[PDB]
Amino acid sequence: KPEDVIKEQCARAKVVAELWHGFTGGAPKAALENLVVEFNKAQQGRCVRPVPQGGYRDLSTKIKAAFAAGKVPTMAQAFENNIALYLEAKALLPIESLGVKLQGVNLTFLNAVRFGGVVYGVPFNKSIQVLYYNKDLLKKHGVPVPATLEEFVAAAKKLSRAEGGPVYWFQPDASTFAYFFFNLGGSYLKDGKLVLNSKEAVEALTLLQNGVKEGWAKPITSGYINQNLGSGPYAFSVDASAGYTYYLRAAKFDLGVATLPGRTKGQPGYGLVQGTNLVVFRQASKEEQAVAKDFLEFVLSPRAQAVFATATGYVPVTEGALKDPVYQAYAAENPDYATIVRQSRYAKFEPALAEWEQIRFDILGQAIKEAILNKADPKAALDRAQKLAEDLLSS
Numbered sequence: 001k002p003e004d005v006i007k008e009q010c011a012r013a014k015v016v017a018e019l020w021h022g023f024t025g026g027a028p029k030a031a032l033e034n035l036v037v038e039f040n041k042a043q044q045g046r047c048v049r050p051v052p053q054g055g056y057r058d059l060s061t062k063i064k065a066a067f068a069a070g071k072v073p074t075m076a077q078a079f080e081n082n083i084a085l086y087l088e089a090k091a092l093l094p095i096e097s098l099g100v101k102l103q104g105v106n107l108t109f110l111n112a113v114r115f116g117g118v119v120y121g122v123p124f125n126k127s128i129q130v131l132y133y134n135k136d137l138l139k140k141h142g143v144p145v146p147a148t149l150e151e152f153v154a155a156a157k158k159l160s161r162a163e164g165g166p167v168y169w170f171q172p173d174a175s176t177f178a179y180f181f182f183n184l185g186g187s188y189l190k191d192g193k194l195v196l197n198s199k200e201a202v203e204a205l206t207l208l209q210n211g212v213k214e215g216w217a218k219p220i221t222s223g224y225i226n227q228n229l230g231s232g233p234y235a236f237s238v239d240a241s242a243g244y245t246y247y248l249r250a251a252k253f254d255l256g257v258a259t260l261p262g263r264t265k266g267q268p269g270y271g272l273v274q275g276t277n278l279v280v281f282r283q284a285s286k287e288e289q290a291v292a293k294d295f296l297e298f299v300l301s302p303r304a305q306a307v308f309a310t311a312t313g314y315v316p317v318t319e320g321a322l323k324d325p326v327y328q329a330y331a332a333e334n335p336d337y338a339t340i341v342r343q344s345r346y347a348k349f350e351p352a353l354a355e356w357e358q359i360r361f362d363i364l365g366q367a368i369k370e371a372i373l374n375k376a377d378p379k380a381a382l383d384r385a386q387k388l389a390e391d392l393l394s395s
């Protein structure tokens with residue numbers, strides 16, 4: 001196993017830089033480990049040790065405990081809102097001071113790690129939402145891949161009627177909500193203030209709740225969508241590009257990947273950007289930080305980017321990745337990699353507020369579950385979310 005090879009590499013190493021992550025397994029965990037094994041081989045007495053912390057929520061809980069225990073790793077994965085939280089504690093090294101070169105990092109991704117003009121993270125494993133679909137089922141009913149929200153609803157209705165069950169599958173969560181909210185003209189910040197209960201928020205949540213009532217949308221309440229496949233007819237889902245390998249292994253049908261339905265055919269829908277940046281903690285030693293500098297330079301290299309992104313369906317974060325022949329060979333044999341990069345052009349983020357992790361799961365996510373699972377009124381559910389978010393922010 002690659003994590004055994006790493007335990008061994010670090011055992012002989014003069015300096016070990018720990019990297020805490022939230023990859024539980026599959027292609028992402030494996031791709032991270034393969035990258036680390038290759039880096040660790042180039043060094044003499046200098047190594048990275050990846051340490052799985054569970055999922056992403058677990059990782060930020062454990063990073064907060066590590067601050068309270070006074071023992072943080074050298075590097076960790078972080079969302080933009082976690083970077084914001086760690087900056088309140090002044091806990092992050094500025095990346096460009098470390099000596100990492102950022103020319104050629106995608107500005108979509110670089111702007112998101114820049115706080116008061118200073119970059120505090122290295123875009124690493126950046127996902128974009130895509131439309132997964134059942135190529136077999138759309139072909140059986142002569143339904144084209146939908147390019148607009150209108151067409152998507154119409155297709156889900158037609159196919160659900162035909163197959164006797166709801167064919168648009170979704171988790172009732174903030175990530176799914178974001179797709180429909182952004183594409184109905186929603187924004188979360190109104191003159192600097194967080195608003196969860198805007199008319200576009202009510203519209204988005206009402207669209208999903210109506211799709212359940214109308215028999216075209218299927219709430220997935222236990223596991224990833226890709227873990228529920230094979231139970232009833234499936235046409236479509238909106239999911240992160242990093243689910244690609246999970247969908248591929250699970251699907252008994254011919255899986256497709258398309259750009260997201262938008263307001264019009266003039267442009268694909270916006271997708272939510274997910275996945276994480278790597279940060280470097282101030283508490284690391286000069287020697288651990290030097291390992292981080294070389295590790296981050298390696299992760300931004302065209303070949304590392306090419307291998308990582310083709311092994312997983314993460315978006316390659318540099319312009320040079322798309323010029324690498326290994327990326328080019330993968331793309332030539334599989335049109336889904338270009339589809340994911342094309343979608344990555346039409347990209348929105350959630351707010352970069354320190355409290356956003358709590359808000360998205362415990363407040364916004366709960367309001368969406370209330371509406372979807374318990375037929376709560378959408379406006380009443382989001383009005384309660386607004387008050388709980390304002391109270392949290394005021395505390």
Ligand SMILES: Nc1nc2c(ncn2[C@@H]2O[C@H](COP(=O)(O)O[C@H]3[C@@H](O)[C@H](n4ccc(=O)[nH]c4=O)O[C@@H]3CO)[C@H]3CC(O)(O)C[C@H]32)c(=O)[nH]1
Nearest residue numbers: 023028056057079081127175224240242243246274275357
């Ligand atoms: N903590 C925290 N999480 C956040 C925040 N913003 C968004 N997210 C979560 O990012 C996940 C997307 O990140 P991504 O790296 O694109 O994809 C993950 C996995 O989701 C996906 N996966 C894993 C196993 C499996 O069977 N299927 C599969 O698709 O593969 C990758 C590695 O595990 C969403 C999913 C969510 O966990 O339910 C909540 C969302 C935040 O601010 N904080």
